[PDB]
Amino acid sequence: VTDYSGSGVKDFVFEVHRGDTTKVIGQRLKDEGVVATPSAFTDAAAGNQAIAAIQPGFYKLRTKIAGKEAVARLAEQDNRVGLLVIPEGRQLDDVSAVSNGAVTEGIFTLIARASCVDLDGDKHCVAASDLRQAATTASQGELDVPDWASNGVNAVRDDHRRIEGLIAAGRWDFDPMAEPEQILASLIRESNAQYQQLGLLSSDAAGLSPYQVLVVASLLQREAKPRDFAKVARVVYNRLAKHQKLEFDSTVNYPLDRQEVATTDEDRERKTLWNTYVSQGLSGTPISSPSPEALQAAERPEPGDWLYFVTIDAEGTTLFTADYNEHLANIELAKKNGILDSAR
């Protein structure tokens, strides 16, 4: 049957849909002018495991090519485009290390990098600043902000940080040729489905909204090691109940876009929507994209009366207590064991 020869005509982005079989992909490849007949694709794909296991997503292909060439291009990992990984605890912005270490790239930078497609020579990317602007100004309906987050987003005006926490840690696909608003919206929709699957909307923890649970998880992700998440969650709720400020360093560092570092009394005094040295209560928005385990801890805090915690040694032991004098003793223990500076 008819099957194209030669090197093709035009590079473009092709989407494999969820539920597409090899046969259906062959039909769609014919309809988009990639292969001359569907069986040109399916014959060449027979017994190919890369094609059999192909994932829904976006793929750089070329028009008017041979079936075996279409198969090779689809099976080549490098032609995958709009595939994004957001590691746990990332922010929207890049975060500098004043610890003398390297920059930590944020979600905008990672989306932009994931968006790049080489089309007939032209490298085509969405720019991080365009994603940031769309986060700053697009309407909630345009970003598909979920209902449980609507009021939290609304209280933060003309700041991209209004959508913090809404793009979850995980692995996502997005159309690299769509507008910045639609890219952000699809990410937020996929994240909302994951958050639902991870229990964010169906939690029975008394007196907490889903948005508040997300905020707590984002704090835990930045302040504690995974082993301690559940206990730190209890500390947070105990302090909220006793109207004691959280005094989390990560809430000071978050808007300065800087990594885990000690904070001065000057920094702790700056009034922001997030600073928990200044104000009682939770941060106004999440301060990071939390891991699934931080979410589970925020939903199911370990029972206990602790109000204080500090890491005291090299192996990461963390002592929790409800007694302030014991907490002072544990702080000094961390200083003698070398973990914490003798003076701030």
Residue numbers in the entry: 1 to 344
What's in the article?
One type of enzyme involved in this process is membrane-bound glycosidase, which cleaves the PG sugar backbone. Lytic transglycosyl­ase (LT), anchored to the cytoplasmic membrane, is a representative glycosidase enzyme that catalyzes nonhydrolytic cleavage of the β-1,4 glycosidic bond between MurNAc and GlcNAc to produce muropeptide products containing a 1,6-anhydro-MurNAc (anhMurNAc) end [Fig. 1(a)]. In a previous study, MltG was characterized as the terminase responsible for achieving PG integration into the cell wall through cleavage of the newly synthesized glycan strand. MltG consists of three domains: an N-terminal TMD, a predicted PG-binding domain and a C-terminal YceG (MltG) catalytic domain.
To obtain a soluble protein for studying the structure of maMltG, we constructed an N-terminal truncated version of the MltG expression vector, in which the N-terminal 84 residues of MltG (i.e. the TMD) were removed. The purified maMltG protein was crystallized and the 2.2 Å high-resolution crystal structure of maMltG was solved using the MR phasing method. A single maMltG molecule was identified in the asymmetric crystallographic unit. Thus, we believe that maMltG exists as a monomer in solution based on the SEC and MALS results.
